């Protein structure tokens, strides 16, 4: 490829897994926001709040694929799994898989950190740290408040916990 | 009638008949709609959510007046009955009220939709697939929505529930 | 009712029995309404002038089921009978209907007042001299008007008469 | 064709007769636009009337050419017969005329849906339903409408009829 | 579940089969824009082309998660698969690897329309032919157009052939 | 005819001829039109060049059943003939077609011109000069600059002439 340059053949590859691992929260997210339509959970700003993080994750791949072809990668697609779940059971138990997933997400983007640094690609490094380690941070700190405020508030048991929580801190 | 074609008299009749039940369930709403703004219940959004279902039920009938009328039928009008309770109970009993009520009328719709297939009437079909099978099916989804969270929240029974799915979701 | 105070029960029973006839002058004008748009009468004006009047009686029961709640009285519904007629023959004969549909109507309401008089209610005698008495007086001049006009002009068998009546009065 | 797709050849047929049958119904309303502004005829809003229903009809024979395109089809041109008559007599008998092209435009189109339904074709039916059926209904029942008032009026014979109409109905 | 009527097993199933559909070709189409982003391809507008088809795609396949839930039927998602290539060779044959798969999914909502049909399921029917078989049939046509300009223009061997198709058509 | 005034039976009955014959070439041009819209043809600019060119024939046949009536002749319609082809075959031959029915058009006008200088009409013959005999001069120089530029692009063998001159000319 006449422009890669510096671009180690083992970043490449763990470019192509990080975007399939990106693609794959989206996903879960995408399960999440639609559990929350059910007429039998109609929590429509859990909803949303989900909708949104799916939309950031698409985001997140899509700039790991645009990075791939910036320095002369290839992408190389595999299958998006489905979620481990359809029924998310509660806005708890929805938010605390989400955590879960975050920090994962976030233990791949810093193991990929550590690659680059690895082969000394400033670059990737860089890229990194603007646009994913950061916002994982701010992204797991967020889904922690909310764990912990529809913890305090009793959910998933208390008939208005995860009632309140969605039209005052999700609206 | 200079107009009449495809127009078979079973249909004409089926509509002279949809045309009551819309307006019978326009009239439950009413009496639905004022049953909240009684001094003992005096929730004035549940109130204003029903006045509002009243309103897109007598479009409903309208509308259907009006297609007998495009079509060359001739509107019969029948009484229109009174609702089965005048106290409604709990904003939880005329939510499930309203969505049995609705589920009778789609059924209604579904089978005037069956009778004009079986005409070989697509003008009617289209005119019921437009205008009423998703509004039907928009309309019990939200029923449904409603239904759920009252009844998780508590209600009728814990005095905050119906009071703050009053302010917050039908605000 | 911790908010009932000087509201006679004969006085909520006549407001309830006029809350059914408000209902049925609508359901009459209704009719009228929808038979003027018919392809053999196709009179639009006449329609509108019919639904117009359908709906200010709508309101006209409303304000009745609110007074009710207003002053701690029961609202209690009954059928709204079908009008007399389907077929309103010209829009002279619709016209002379709904001048005695208002007459009618007007005896009521006065009737209703001699009874607020009666069981000295001033509030319920205000509101009937406020929103009601003068509009049926309003009401039945008009309907006086255009009968006038209309059997002046002809109507029903001078074939230009409701044409223009229907074009020039009531455009 | 490599975009054809359940697209039956007696539809795509039916389709090229159903264009020529549009395109003449646009001819006859063409005939009758410029009927009335003969200078002994001279009902200019009768002219427009016509000229516009011309325009419609030529909308409708160009969105089946644009359709048989989108499906793969190829459209097939065949003459445009000239209308019956020259002269059309009257303001009466003109949109008698157009009452009786209509309906049979209208059973065309109803033929053509079942051929559609038989074949299995659901976007050639809801291509019907969504452009041609409904609009066919409100044409035919205005054309009626029409026909009702001019008669009710004494057209032909009656000097004043035509002339009254043109200026208030049609203007 | 309390808003589910008339609404079929195999519906739901075969409406979970098809959100599965449409995000495979949402992930095809995605493939596809980012291939043309590599820095031996470079061609921006037939990335921001079938980055737009990628989206089209995602939103029928949102619309349809919500339609399971607005009938209460249960989302049940699977695997998405990866496509079938990450190298699409040229801009023709990715034009017509497009065209291939938008008549399979066509294919697929013509399948579950015919099961509609078969289980009377008219809102499942309109739902389809309002916001899918219409979309497919223009997409279908539009690939179609470009596929046999960018054939006649000679590509893809003509080195001028894709470049100024995508600047001109696609820009 | 009381309008009627040095207005000769020849010319009349020639008006009549032009009438149909300006239609007919509106509709070859409509022909052509749909023609570039094929998925195997899909130039869309070829398109609305000879839509354009349909209407422009449209409203010179029109304005001649305008002055038909305007002079108290009266117009008799004929069939208006299906095009010599439905299928155009090239850009080109389009075009060169296009050119060969101004050129017929234009000689027919001319006669027309000296039917009117023959009878000594010179309201007709200043119609023609001032509304078609200049408009067909500019019409068929632009569709010989046309022609000429396609040819020497290598129309309709060269791929990329038909695609270019559609993007460049006729955009
Ligand atoms: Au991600
Ligand atoms: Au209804
Ligand atoms: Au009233
Ligand atoms: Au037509
Ligand atoms: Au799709
Ligand atoms: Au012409």
Same mark, same amino acid.
């Given at each position: ?94 938010? *605390?898989?989400?955590? =879960?997933? !975050? ?6 983007? #810093?193991?990929? %950190?550590?690659?680059?640094?690895? &082969? ?8 990194? *740290?603007?646009?994913? =380690?950061? !916002? ?6 967020? #889904?922690?408040? %909310?764990?912990?405020?529809?913890? &305090? ?8 916990? *995860? ?9």
């Amino acid at each position: 490829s006449r422009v890669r340059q510096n671009f180690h053949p083992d970043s490449e590859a763990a470019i192509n897994r990080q975007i399939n691992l990106c693609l794959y929260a989206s996903y879960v997210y995408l399960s999440m926001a639609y559990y929350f339509s059910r007429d039998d959970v109609a929590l429509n700003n859990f909803s949303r709040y989900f909708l949104h993080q799916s939309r950031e994750c698409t985001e997140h791949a899509e700039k790991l694929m645009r990075l791939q072809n910036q320095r002369g990668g290839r992408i190389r697609l595999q299958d998006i799994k489905k979620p481990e779940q359809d029924d998310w059971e509660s806005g708890l138990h929805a938010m *605390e898989g989400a955590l =879960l997933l !975050e920090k994962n997400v976030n233990q791949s983007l #810093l193991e990929l %950190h550590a690659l680059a640094s690895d &082969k000394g690609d400033p670059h990737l490094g860089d890229f990194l *740290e603007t646009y994913y =380690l950061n !916002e994982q941070v701010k992204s797991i700190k967020e #889904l922690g408040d %909310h764990v912990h405020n529809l913890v &305090k508030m009793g959910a998933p048991d208390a008939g208005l916990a *995860e009632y309140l929580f969605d039209t005052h801190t999700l609206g």
